[PDB]
Amino acid sequence: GSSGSSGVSQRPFRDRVLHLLALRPYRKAELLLRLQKDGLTQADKDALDGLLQQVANMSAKDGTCTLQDCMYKDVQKDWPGYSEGDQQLLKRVLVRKLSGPSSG
């Protein structure tokens, strides 16, 4: 929502993945195919592996990446990626992550 229509390509790369994981845990292969749908190159593929470990946590058994708790603070609600079912889903997620118990 900036000029004419809305597009995800116009948005950076960190945001493209920051929003994907924001919803639910996304794996390397699963997230790769998701980004590839809009546009993914060799520079984004390799960079993704290093970005996920930074803006996400990977398990040594399951094989899925989960967005951090503080990283959620850098998440918007007007993301072209979402629409309705995804937006509402992110709401309950933001609550569990952002603003919670005293320490934990």
- Angle of helix 13-23 relative to helix 42-54, nearest 10 degrees? 50
Nearest CA among 23, 93, 103, 28 for reference residue 65 = 28
Whole-angstrom distance, CA of residue 104 vs CA of residue 21: 21
Task: Pick 1-104's CATH classification: 1.10.760.10, 3.30.70.20, 1.10.3720.10, 1.10.10.2670.
Answer: 1.10.10.2670
Residue 65 pairs in a beta bridge with 26, 58
4 token code pair: 């004419």
**Total residues found in the chain within this entry:** 104
Ramachandran bin of 82, using left for φ above 0, alpha for ψ from -120 to 50, beta for the remaining angles? beta
H-type alpha helices, the chain:
13-23, 28-38, 42-54, 85-97
Nearest CA among 25, 98, 101 for reference residue 61 = 25
Domain ranges of the chain: 1-104
Q: Contacts from 5-12 at CB under 8 Å and sequence distance 24+?
A: 6/80, 7/80, 8/38, 8/80, 8/81, 9/38, 9/39, 11/79, 11/80
Q: How was this structure determined?
A: NMR
